[PDB]
Symmetry: C6
Subunit: 109 residues, 6 copies
């Protein structure tokens, strides 16, 4: 079995840019939010970029930030489906173009 030294640094990636269009009651309940609208879910690396993603999403009409987590690199936000989708697009486009991030497709459930 070969052995190597791995110098570990964070990559630059959005691994999830997702809208739950019509969450079930239990999902609203676990976030502690109003049981209305869609939920956007973002996974980012490095984790500090959560605050940047939350700032992009929360600037848009109809978007309320549910939480910004710099410890896990996660953002969740609420809005109508169309607002949530375009804010996910704003995040993907900013991070791809400006920070050279690897990105995933916008996904929907």
């Amino acid at each position: 079995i070969d052995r190597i030294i791995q110098e570990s640094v964070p990559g630059k990636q959005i691994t999830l840019a997702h809208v739950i269009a019509a969450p079930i009651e239990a999902v609203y309940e676990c976030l502690g939010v109003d049981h209305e609208g869609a939920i956007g879910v973002v996974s980012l690396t490095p984790n500090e970029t959560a605050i940047i993603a939350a700032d992009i999403a929360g600037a848009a009409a109809n978007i309320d930030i549910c939480f910004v987590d710099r410890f896990t690199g996660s953002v969740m936000f609420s809005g109508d489906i169309q607002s949530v989708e375009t804010s996910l697009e704003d995040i993907l486009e900013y991070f791809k173009n400006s920070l050279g991030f690897s990105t995933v497709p916008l996904t929907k459930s």
Copy 2:
């Protein structure tokens, strides 16, 4: 021994999609749940996808969500064996077909 720089990012994978058909008493007690029915257990990466899997499980079948853990990337839920298996199948199908995630088989004990 050589040295390489590793840019660490989360992968996109379900590593466990499991039903315990007839849990022992100690296992119901560790989850704090009613001592009836089957338990479904899911391991996901990136961890934020736990909320997506919980939403699919609750919409797929008459199950009770035990917890949704975005910190560990884990979901557990309860219901009759058929209901829990339906929920696991719907998670695995959606994550594979719609998210392009790596998946595992639906496993049973």
Copy 3:
């Protein structure tokens, strides 16, 4: 940067996912008093210790252990992927064997042998 350039250190992206493995399935036949005290358990019998990946499989291993033999579960830890349980040596070994056989034969996970101290 300078360290990387002058060291000619290469760079790769690694997508991290958990593997599927039992890395420890161990019986302490006759624990010392301090080990029983650290688990907060009765100072009698053997202790079984299991290390699993991914960590959520701890609850599956605990269920098999308790169904396999007359053991008392000490803890089931889905945060660390760990299970510990207690009982007479033969019961603890039976439970460890049943965990290894299920994970190897039904799940196809990588498994270590049963080890004893």
Copy 4:
């Protein structure tokens, strides 16, 4: 195990150590109200955000930032390797530039460019 054998998945030992890198040196010029609220800071000025490895270098970056320009440190986090600070846009950019130049030129760390939103 069966999954590994039939998938012909190879196995390597990786000795994990931290690298030496700034992965983020970023100014939010005009934060939204919710971002100021999440940091618990005055709702005025730009925010600077730094991601460092190894995480203990957060205190070094905070010291440079505060010495470089009239900024207010929001937090210094040696557990996550993170620094955030606030001030007028030109002060926040000066502090980020001074962090990048010190880490690149004095320490030889890998560094990203200064980024703006």
Copy 5:
């Protein structure tokens, strides 16, 4: 830049088997122990093996376990220098021979 999927599992290794022969006061103070004797320090992977190492060390004459940490994979114990050294040797020999661990030399400060 190449990209690979890393299936992460714990290795089997003792990375540290160390005796501080005559700790300074501050080191005794940080462990909350009597300011006498040497300190043995063990780093193990997987972390659950801390309990096995603590059982081997604590069985020996003169050894008191300071702490056993299954969350970090760490053990610290106290005794006279010679007892601490032979207990570190007992741990290294058990884990190398029985569990096939990679091991380091016994080190001393």
Copy 6:
């Protein structure tokens, strides 16, 4: 994209051995220390070696240990610039020459 199994173990490395010669007030305040003298900062792997580095630092020179963190693998200490530099030098020499660890230069700001 190919897949490999990575057996993860800690490496043996000091990644930071740093003196802040004249800290700003906010930095003394974040550590909760007297606003006088230099600060030494050490990053170690495996994390248990923090206690070994703290012991060497305290025995090397007239320094005050701020914290010894075996959870993060970190040590910080305070003293006059000469004392702090002596302590960092003794840590780097011992870890390189006696433990066979990878080290970094003694760095200054």
